[PDB]
């Protein structure tokens, strides 16, 4: 099946439900963490603890399809190089959200 | 208890 159904299940995305929307990010850990001393903007949420890739990434987002419904999770794959917007947080301050894309 | 941090990367991660 697409990379979608098939990541969302294998990591434990869709195994007990399926979820609207996720992105995965194809880069490496250390590249996403350091993110987090990159560009401060506003989260979605207006706190203050999100910040923005300088450059773009690829990604892939996943979004259900409009009959999807568990267990038969259905998703469309869309592939993209886009900045990426995560909210850290703790010491050491790493990623804990994904925020946005653009 | 899987961490924040543990969270985002199964959720988010594929290098
Ligand atoms: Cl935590």
Redesign the interface.
């Known amino acids: 099946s697409n990379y979608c159904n098939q990541m969302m299940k294998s990591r434990n995305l869709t195994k007990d439900r399926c979820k609207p929307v996720n992105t995965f990010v194809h880069e490496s850990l250390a590249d996403v963490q350091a993110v987090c001393s990159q560009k401060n903007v506003a989260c979605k949420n207006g706190q203050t603890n999100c910040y923005q890739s300088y450059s773009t990434m690829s990604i892939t987002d996943c979004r259900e399809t409009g009959s999807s419904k568990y267990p038969n999770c259905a998703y469309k794959t869309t592939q993209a190089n886009k900045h990426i917007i995560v909210a850290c947080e703790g010491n050491p301050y790493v990623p804990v959200h994904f925020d946005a894309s653009v | 208890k899987e961490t924040?941090?543990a969270x985002?990367?199964?959720x988010?991660?594929?290098?």
Do not use: I, V
């Not at chain 2, 988010?12 to 290098?15: G, M, T």
């Open positions: 924040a941090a985002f990367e199964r988010h991660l594929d290098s």
